Design a protein around this ligand. Structure first.
Ligand SMILES: Nc1nc2c(ncn2[C@@H]2O[C@H](COP(=O)(O)OP(=O)(O)OP(=O)(O)O)[C@@H](O)[C@H]2O)c(=O)[nH]1
Ligand SMILES: Nc1nc2c(ncn2[C@@H]2O[C@H](COP(=O)(O)OP(=O)(O)O)[C@@H](O)[C@H]2O)c(=O)[nH]1
Ligand SMILES: Nc1nc2c(ncn2[C@@H]2O[C@H](COP(=O)(O)OP(=O)(O)O)[C@@H](O)[C@H]2O)c(=O)[nH]1
Ligand SMILES: [Mg+2]
Lengths: 430, 427, 49, 427
């Protein structure tokens, strides 16, 4: 009746794809063969008998990550044409993943996403996942959004990407790809979320009690956040939030859109039995810098808008009291030309657990997505790192040889400076 | 034979409408499948006001449900009364609401306008008489604030004589459900001032306070919060549906309470309200009822009357009661608190009596008043709007729909002048 | 001019205190609702039951 | 129509009041569920004095309960007849049962008093008439003593005409429990002397002497001791509630017994009292009742009347009897014991008769008297307070809540003259 389409790019995108859809099928009850032992039609299509199919497309430029899905347990659920794999990856090169290898497969994918759009009578929105440091995630991700911008126009293109960590890095060429991909993000993305791996590691150890995690555990934390966001579209609630509502309330400016994410309560299955976890308790926990999924302190900056999403036995009165109590704090700063600053959404379906899981059977939870000026701290670190490498021309030969003109390097640097100015200009007060 | 047509707009409107139809259906005694199994001949006297009869002993409400996204409608279908409504009266779009007034008014509002109007024409021109229409919507939203006002202008153009009574929910001052509310509220009020005859304002914060401090509900859900709204909306039309010692329909209310065409915004309040454990000890009488109505804590709108002055007041009573006792309290409440009434209008309290009370209550009363305390409500939105309007970027969401920035200035100027108009009639 | 500065901050502290004392008074009413009106009736129900 | 408002304060007052309302509910025939289920029409003549009417035959007393923490009320809210009390009539603070008089009066009293006064105004301005109030509190404690005197001052300022008749329990002379009694009693006396019209002093040790001797009960519970007090409180107001041969209300009592504004402290007594085994053989007659009342051992205050002399006295009898028999005993008892009465006032004994006696007793008697024997009680607390103030470390606890050291001197200065005032009138 109302549909959103999921697009996954890169190794992170495919690995996140398994992490989220394992929850969707389990939350809805679908056997991994597609049978049953509702909101089914928001995420799935029916093929007769009792067999369902997810509304998603997985794309990567190398077959290893995708073939795990093809050989995995969940192979029967997905449609063969949705899983698209290239021949050779971009090798952490934006230029390779945008012009040379990206254009070899772009038009094949655009048929499958558009063909999937035929079966959506009430399509409203896309979801796109990246890893900024990767080549296919940035190089091919930029080419995908530019086409989807003109193919469909005024359709919500929400993004949920993995920003580079403030210090943790797995690729040396990481600063180059992030800035170049940022230029493609700002003009085409309706709204793009941030998480970073370094903060997730700390949260997966402190609040949730695991000595040593893997990317699989981090993928399940991200899966919870996406579920809470989409719960309003799928399940009944006193206060539903559609995608188009979420676009207007959060972003104050065309280019300031970038929000940040948090989830509460995050607590081990052992210790979660120890507390009542009232609405006031969970609401307070979100606003601490320690719980943030992005390693930037909000106290350095200010808040521009906030959105709170509740999933459980959560009553409207105690939400308003809890949000009222937050405004009493004078460590939570707001730009005084933003007087209201909040949208609350309420859904009745409680959070769903997973076998072999890492969270508990909590009875009520809260999700938060807000825009803050503290993200200019993250942009500054990337900006300085890029300048040091570009001053001595540390890696230019690889990018130019792969079709990219060198004139794009100062353009992306200049465009980021405008974005930094926009955040500082918004931070001004009258 | 004074038929009234019912219109529900948006997520807020549909959920309010759903509970309200439960209340009347119980009152007349109509089963959720639509057939009468009541208990008295009186309930069939004037059921024609709200129900049409589909031959077969089935009654169909005179309701139209309007939304931009199908999510709200399907919840209504799954309810116990989903099958009651006529299927063709469900009019919905296939696009996101947007939570934006300009997009709701111009982008999706135009397309839905012609389809909805012909559905209204089917219900409007199906009855021997038509007193007026009845709209329920929210002002902080995008569909109810945007598309609701668009239909209100077209309804005025085609049916000037009929009473366009509206029930509105006003954005809350402390914590509110939407960020862009100052734009949505300001642009909507300009449309409401010139079009609707009667507008009732309700704030969600007061319902939280009344349910918690008075009704003693620890966890008041929207079901009980909407339940309070339904009693007031049922009480106003009670005179049409039932006999009484002194009748008073909508047009009597507008004539008496509205001294000038633009001062017609009202507050509402309902009595008696008692804790469902403490109800036994209350000696509920006529004087006890009057205490609750004029008490400032029972106002469903968060605008303390004591900070302003009253212009006109109206009281509705239901049940078998003394006419002398009812008339005496209007004297006493007016004389004891003369500091809170305008001197240049004597007899500021209107009264009416109805025979038949709601279920469970032997007697009940309803209050509607007009006061200058609404300057508090409009001050909050105007000051908040002024902060937001200097931050010009939020307007860009409205510019991408085609709204010209001068419309923001026109809306605020009309709204600002309305506050000044209430100031001068305080003197 | 920092001692004028605290005068602004102190007055906002008083404003913050008074703004939240209204809510704390309402909270006190909530405590009266549960403990006084409800839970003393709970002891009423206790020896009645 | 002489409604009397019953105000209860503190740990001591609540326990007594629960027993007190138990007695009246049985006398009028009020079912513990709140409905009348009695046996006589005469009970319904003047039930307005202590009860309010609810449509449905439910009667709720005019009671106000005050304490610094709910825990004492929660026992009362539990208490057998607890359902009778109106739920909103319970006003308690958020602090402990602080025995410090200054703590109760200043810190927590001011917060509670404003809430308490409006609750009293609910009952005070609800009925046709209001003769006087009725306070039951303690003087050696902190909650009843401190806050009780604070409310008593504010009751006078708003209702000067009405009678401030109070029932107080006195610090025991041999062994009490709270160690700081001299401070709490002395500070309370200054508030009591000037504000209250009538004060009946009750000492536990006298109650601990009659239960042992007369009733012959080895373990009489706290209900038993409060039952003895409840008889006196019922007898005084019984003249209002029922017809009789010679009516005597509170205002009659104050005029006769009080010769000067500060000499108004009273000693109370009740008859008949008999061991529960020997009740069958007692030839209970009107002269037999007279013997018990004037017997020194039946006094409920440990202040021997033989030590001093009487100024005024009053006796109330209940039942259909001979008026000659009652009047002859007042002549007989007065002339036979002239050594204990003042020459300059003849006819020092007042009398009254009521038609209806209490349940179980064919006829009952109540005694209220005034004598200089109160000098013994105050000489006790005077000289005991003397050594208190020479070692002033205890004052710090009272100082921490703002009490100045001059208040101790002022409080002692007042009751020392009160002791002197009773001395000079002995001549
Ligand atoms: N949070 C999270 N990040 C991942 C995961 N897998 C990969 N990444 C991120 O991806 C980055 C490396 O890039 P790739 O995973 O190869 O993404 P790509 O765009 O496909 O790059 P290419 O393989 O060259 O095409 C790492 O720095 C990780 O931060 C994952 O499972 N979870
Ligand atoms: N009292 C009450 N308010 C509601 C209910 N449902 C929604 N609202 C209010 O409606 C406002 C905005 O609703 P929205 O979804 O934007 O409706 P729209 O006008 O169609 O866009 C919010 O502030 C809600 O508090 C309800 O059932 N009861
Ligand atoms: N006769 C009688 N005395 C009591 C009762 N309850 C407490 N007391 C006495 O009252 C004195 C002071 O009690 P306290 O708790 O301080 O009462 P408060 O002044 O209201 O705080 C103590 O010495 C107790 O012995 C009762 O039910 N009956
Ligand atoms: Mg890849």
């Amino acid at each position: 009746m109302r549909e959103v389409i999921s697009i996954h790019v890169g190794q992170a995108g495919v690995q996140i794809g398994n992490g989220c859809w394992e929850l969707y099928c389990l939350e809805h009850g679908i056997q991994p063969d597609g049978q049953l032992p509702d909101a089914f039609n928001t995420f799935f299509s029916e093929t007769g008998a009792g067999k369902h199919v997810p509304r998603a497309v997985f794309v990567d430029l190398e077959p290893t990550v995708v073939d795990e899905v093809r050989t995995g347990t969940y192979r029967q659920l997905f449609h063969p044409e949705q899983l698209i794999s290239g021949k050779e990856d971009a090798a952490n090169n934006y230029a390779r993943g945008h012009y040379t290898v990206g254009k070899e497969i772009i038009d094949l994918t655009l048929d499958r996403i558009r063909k999937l759009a035929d079966q959506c009578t009430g399509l409203q929105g896309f979801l796109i996942f990246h890893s900024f440091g990767g080549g296919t995630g940035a190089g091919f991700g930029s080419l995908l959004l530019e086409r989807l911008s003109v193919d469909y126009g005024k359709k919500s293109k929400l993004e949920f990407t993995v920003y580079p960590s403030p210090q943790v890095s797995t690729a040396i060429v990481e600063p180059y790809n992030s800035i170049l991909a940022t230029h493609s993000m700002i003009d085409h993305s309706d709204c793009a979320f941030m998480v970073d791996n370094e903060a997730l590691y700390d949260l997966c150890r402190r609040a949730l009690d695991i000595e040593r995690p893997t990317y699989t555990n981090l993928n399940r934390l991200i899966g919870q956040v996406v579920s809470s966001l989409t719960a309003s579209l799928r399940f009944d609630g006193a206060l539903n939030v559609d995608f188009t509502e979420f676009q207007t309330n959060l972003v104050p400016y065309a280019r300031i859109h970038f929000p940040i994410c948090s989830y509460a309560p995050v607590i081990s299955a052992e210790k979660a039995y120890h507390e009542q976890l009232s609405v006031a308790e969970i609401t307070n926990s979100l606003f601490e810098p320690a719980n943030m999924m992005v390693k930037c302190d909000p106290r350095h900056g200010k808040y521009m808008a906030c959105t709170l999403l509740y999933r459980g036995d959560v009553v409207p009165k105690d939400v308003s009291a809890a949000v009222a109590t937050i405004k009493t704090k004078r460590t939570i700063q707001f730009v005084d030309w933003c007087p209201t600053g909040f949208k609350m959404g309420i859904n009745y379906q409680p959070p769903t657990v997973v076998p072999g899981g890492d969270l508990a059977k909590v009875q009520r939870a809260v999700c938060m997505l807000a825009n803050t000026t503290a993200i200019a701290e993250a942009w500054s670190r990337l900006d300085h790192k890029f300048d040091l490498m570009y001053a001595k021309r540390a890696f230019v030969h690889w990018y130019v040889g792969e079709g990219m003109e060198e004139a794009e390097f100062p353009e992306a640097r200049e465009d980021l400076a405008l974005l930094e100015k926009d955040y500082d200009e918004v931070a001004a007060e009258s | 034979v004074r038929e009234i047509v019912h219109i529900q707009a948006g997520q807020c409107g549909n959920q309010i409408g759903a509970k309200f139809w439960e209340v009347i259906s119980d009152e007349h005694g109509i089963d959720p499948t639509g057939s009468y199994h009541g208990d008295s001949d009186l309930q069939l006297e004037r059921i024609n006001v709200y129900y049409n009869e589909a031959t077969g002993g089935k009654y169909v409400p005179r309701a139209i449900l309007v939304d931009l996204e199908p999510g709200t409608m399907d919840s209504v279908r799954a309810g116990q009364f989903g099958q009651l409504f006529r299927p063709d009266n469900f009019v919905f779009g296939q696009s996101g609401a947007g939570n934006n007034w300009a997009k709701g008014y111009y982008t999706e509002g135009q397309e839905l306008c012609e389809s909805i109007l012909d559905v209204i024409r089917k219900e409007a021109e199906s009855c021997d008489c038509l007193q007026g229409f009845q709209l329920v919507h929210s002002l902080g939203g995008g569909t109810g604030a945007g598309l609701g006002t668009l239909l209100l202008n077209k309804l005025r153009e085609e049916y000037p004589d009929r009473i366009l009574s509206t029930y509105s929910i006003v954005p809350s001052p402390k914590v509110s459900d939407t960020v862009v509310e100052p734009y949505n509220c300001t642009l909507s009020v300009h449309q409401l001032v010139e079009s609707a005859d009667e507008v009732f304002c309700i704030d969600n914060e007061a319902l939280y306070d009344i349910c918690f401090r008075t009704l003693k509900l620890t966890t008041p859900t929207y079901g009980d919060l909407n339940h309070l709204v339904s009693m007031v909306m049922s009480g106003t039309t009670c005179a049409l549906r039932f006999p009484g010692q002194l009748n008073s329909d909508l047009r009597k209310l507008a004539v008496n309470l509205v001294p000038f065409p633009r001062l017609h915004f009202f507050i509402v309040g309902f009595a008696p309200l008692t804790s469902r454990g403490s109800q036994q000890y209350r000696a509920l009488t006529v004087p006890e009822l009057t205490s609750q109505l004029f008490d400032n804590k029972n106002m469903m709108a968060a605008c303390d009357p004591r900070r302003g002055v009253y212009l006109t007041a109206s009281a509705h009573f239901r049940g078998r009661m003394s006419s002398k006792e009812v008339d005496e309290q209007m004297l006493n409440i007016q004389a004891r608190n003369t500091s809170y009434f305008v001197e240049w209008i004597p007899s500021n309290v209107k009264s009416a009596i109805c025979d038949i009370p709601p279920r469970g209550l032997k007697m009940a009363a309803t209050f509607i008043g007009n006061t200058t305390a609404f300057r508090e409500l409009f001050t909050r939105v105007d000051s908040q709007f002024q902060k937001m309007y200097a931050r010009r970027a939020f307007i860009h969401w409205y510019v991408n729909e085609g709204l010209e920035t001068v419309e923001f200035d026109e809306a605020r100027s009309n709204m600002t002048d309305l506050i000044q108009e209430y100031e001068m009639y305080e003197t | 001019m920092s001692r004028p500065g605290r005068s602004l901050g102190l007055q906002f502290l008083m404003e913050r205190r008074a703004r939240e004392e209204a809510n704390r008074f309402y909270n006190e009413a909530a405590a009266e609702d549960n403990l006084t009106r409800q839970r003393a009736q709970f002891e009423q129900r206790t020896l009645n039951r």
